[PDB]
Design a protein around this nucleic acid. Structure first.
Ligand SMILES: Nc1ncnc2c1ncn2[C@@H]1O[C@H](COP(=O)(O)OP(=O)(O)NP(=O)(O)O)[C@@H](O)[C@H]1O
Ligand SMILES: Nc1ncnc2c1ncn2[C@@H]1O[C@H](COP(=O)(O)OP(=O)(O)NP(=O)(O)O)[C@@H](O)[C@H]1O
Ligand SMILES: [Mg+2]
Ligand SMILES: [Mg+2]
Ligand SMILES: [Mg+2]
Ligand SMILES: [Mg+2]
Ligand code: NA
Ligand code: NA
Lengths: 396, 397
DNA sequence: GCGCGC
DNA sequence: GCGCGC
DNA sequence: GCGCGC
DNA sequence: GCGCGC
């Protein structure tokens, strides 16, 4: 028996690929509650988005099936349908081998949200079954896996299609012995597809729920500008939609900003179309550029006098809605963790900072009345903050 | 033919070997490749030594920053196994070169441990331009060396003898300067982490020696989270004694110490199997829930909150609060978010902590009524200050 | 100067 | 509240 | 009720 | 401010 007094070579165990995912799902998807369940949806949708980001496919359709499984169909290039160098179908490599993919800089993708080579295989590992259908060159191919990613068929030709059609259809049943819930939630998926649609010009994303026969689709022509208008939808706005974009050594930056009459700071950031809810270097560059340029404008126009302190970043972000979307070349791309909630790529900070600072400095100079109103707004925010502080300290 | 977006076929998919994948995507394993990521490597090697001590093996963990900028961690635990592993190579090589390979999957070699993924040592090796390990066991010292991201350059070889009973593991590594934006280990960063680790290991000495400047420091504490809380309040005026609560629940173990200072900040630290969870999670949620619920219940049943008064906010009771929560979670229930283990996900930790703390704190307040009523009056004043600030803010707008 | 993390 | 690094 | 994550 | 889950 293995115990603390018998700690020898058989006390060390090696978990084969997908078994490690099933044993330690928290390392790969963060949690095994509803947030982790929907993470599986995001891995499959993100792979369809990456095809669209490289130019392939104009529709991504998600279906919640009546049995509770979930399907994602795209019209991208399809997965490669041949034999892989390691002696199994490439499709089976994609779904069964961790750190196996096409987004390590080889050239099959332009900038993509995918980069670790694990998402599809993680979905397969954490599903009681998974099926994939690839359409390419007049044929449809299928492979099925069960019980956490074990192939039960090879990749087989199952039908034909028009010669020019292409795409990938993935259906999976999340493993009810892993997750505390396997109930996919319409609104959770709907909100995420809506966000993704803002970032993919003229791609339609849709959700159909066969459990209740409800469906919704999303399509936007104007990217982050439409997104900012959506954020301020149920609010009174105090400014037009400001739009800033630029490029820098393979990086691309787009940002839309608009003030509402509220006092909340509502900044959403994205890297290669992946939501980074916890921000990171790109959000840091945006926030720094705003504060530095607005303070410089305030001071050089005398709205902040010689004796006044600079305003705080939070003063300028009161009532601000902003959407920041950047594209980062694969060679510079670095996320914190499989969940990709934060961007670590150091170059994104000067990239975003430089582009935003340049465009905003010019915008303030050309729109002086709006600029001074924005500063006066931030000064009133400072006054309210300092009034609250004085009352809090006096109460104490 | 060149791989490009118009030639996306079977050769466009590449499979990365384990350590190669770590080097290619370090953010997936250590979060970042700045100074925080650099020191993460230290925590992986230290955490393994702490896990030995948590199972009862070793009472001293010595960290050395060497003159060449490498880092050594030496423990006196059981040592890594020195034989041949079932997969074909020496066990030591499996530990350092194979991801998801280890002794903390429930097999029984460890009691409750901070390690659980089987990746930490192999990540440090992958991200080092060299690494050496020396194992002391069965009267001998064995050494193996790896270079260039984890490639063995020696076999595991005997390099000396040892007394029959002595055991331990010594790991030295040079972080890869081609990966990290800084490879300058920071004395204060490591010292702070070892200090926190010492509070949670009764009577284990942890030490740091920096050969670059010839400075050293040790940490050794007898009274656990109570010493820890006193440390947090060291440069402040305190308003209460150290309150200590502990309990057990179906293999879970909970300890918490609390003490108010005269400040207005809240300073709550949480740990799971001695791993700092800086972003909290289910155990910290349970603790915060229990405090708010029990303190509002006490305030209301004593009439300090009248019929028409709203309950106080959790932030009113945490003003000036210092608190150290340490829980032990059995392997079969243990689940962290991510390799950096900044947040506990284990669902059962919430009811476990909430139940133990609520029970103990309810009884404590009933038995210490004058102190309880003073703490409620303090939180009511915090409510008043928060309401005064909100009023003034709204009137300014 | 600035955001960030302690 | 302060040092760190961009 | 409570903390949490929108 | 509000729903979700413990
Ligand atoms: N819908 C798809 N269409 C075409 N190819 C796909 C599709 N989904 C996945 N692939 C291919 O399969 C590879 C592996 O996918 P996956 O395991 O999710 O890793 P990844 O996108 O490369 N990186 P990550 O998601 O960050 O783990 C991808 O890199 C693509 O080459
Ligand atoms: N100092 C040590 N003394 C004894 N055994 C050790 C020591 N360090 C590592 N090991 C063994 O090597 C195994 C693998 O270590 P490691 O790769 O760090 O993964 P881990 O501790 O199991 N889990 P994690 O650290 O969460 O990735 C451990 O589980 C132990 O069995
Ligand atoms: Mg992917
Ligand atoms: Mg997430
Ligand atoms: Mg470990
Ligand atoms: Mg950390
Ligand atoms: Na994969
Ligand atoms: Na390992």
């Amino acid at each position: 028996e293995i115990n603390i007094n018998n700690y020898n070579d058989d006390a060390i165990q090696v978990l084969e690929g997908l078994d490690a995912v099933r044993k330690r799902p928290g390392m790969y998807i963060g949690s095994t509650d509803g947030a982790g369940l929907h993470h599986l949806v995001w891995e499959i949708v993100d792979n369809a988005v990456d095809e669209a980001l490289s130019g392939f496919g104009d529709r991504i359709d998600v279906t919640i099936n009546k049995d509770g499984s979930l399907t994602v169909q795209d019209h991208g290039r399809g997965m490669p349908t041949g034999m892989h160098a390691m002696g199994i179908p490439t499709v089976e490599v994609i779904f069964t081998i961790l750190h196996a993919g096409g987004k390590f800089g080889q050239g099959g993708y332009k900038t993509s949200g995918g980069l670790h080579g694990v998402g599809s295989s993680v979905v397969n590992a954490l599903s009681s079954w998974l099926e994939v259908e690839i359409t390419r060159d007049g044929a449809v191919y299928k492979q099925r896996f069960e019980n956490g990613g074990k192939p039960v068929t090879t990749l087989k030709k199952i039908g034909t299609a028009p010669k020019s059609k292409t795409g990938t259809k993935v259906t999976f049943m999340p493993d009810a012995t892993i997750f505390s819930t396997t109930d996919f939630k319409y609104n959770t998926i709907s909100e995420r597809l809506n966000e993704s649609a803002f970032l993919l010009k003229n791609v339609t994303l849709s959700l159909t729920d066969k459990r209740t026969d409800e469906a919704i689709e999303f399509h936007y022509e104007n990217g982050v500008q439409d997104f900012v208008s959506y954020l301020n939808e149920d609010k009174e706005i105090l400014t037009p939609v400001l739009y800033f974009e630029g490029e820098d050594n393979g990086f691309q930056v787009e940002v839309a900003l608009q003030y509402n009459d509220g006092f909340s700071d509502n900044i959403l950031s994205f890297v290669n179309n992946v939501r980074t809810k916890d921000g990171g270097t790109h959000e840091t560059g945006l926030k720094s550029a705003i504060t530095k340029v607005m303070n410089d404008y305030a001071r050089k126009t005398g709205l902040l006098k010689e004796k006044d302190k600079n305003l705080e970043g939070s003063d300028y972000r009161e009532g601000l809605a902003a959407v920041l979307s950047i594209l980062v070349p694969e060679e510079h791309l670095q996320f914190e963790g499989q969940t990709k909630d934060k961007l670590g790529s150091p170059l994104a900070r000067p990239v975003v900072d430089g582009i935003v600072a340049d465009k905003l400095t010019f915008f303030l100079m050309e729109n002086g009345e709006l600029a001074s109103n924005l500063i006066r707004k931030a000064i009133k925010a400072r006054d309210a903050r300092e009034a609250a502080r004085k009352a809090r300290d006096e109460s104490r």
